[PDB]
Symmetry: C2
Amino acid sequence: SNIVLTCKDLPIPIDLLSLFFDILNERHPSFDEHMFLQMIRKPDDPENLSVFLKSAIWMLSHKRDLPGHYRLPLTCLVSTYSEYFVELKP
Amino acid sequence: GLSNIVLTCKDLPIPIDLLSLFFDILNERHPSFDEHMFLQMIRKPDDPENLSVFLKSAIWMLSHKRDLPGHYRLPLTCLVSTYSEYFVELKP
């Protein structure tokens, strides 16, 4: 009836992270490869985290050609990474 | 009654003034985002654009708002984390 998924051990297609980076970096050209990997590793700046999450949210809320098999892992990325805001303050 | 009730997100208490503050900030940025749409979103987001706007206000409060009370951080992050989940089935 109901399935519980741990977003932390959920597989993420490499092509999704690549797409996500491409979209975020087009929007914010100063958001480079190195900063993207540091975000995946551990968010360390609230404004950068904000822009990272906002690109993922745009992809989920506006992008009409997002492959449907990216919806679950991309949503899990949003839910997982938003958690860093508890300690990461302006 | 509404002052004494403990609402929870993922078993974490969400202070009632936090929901009021969230609504006030969201509604100030988007005056057409009324109380009824706010309550519907709370019950079940039904529009990906409206949910996007709802989440972006909460993310703004966490990322930019310097005077957000400290004890609001965990419940508000909970709300972000939980309401984002609706995107799995809610498509543009």
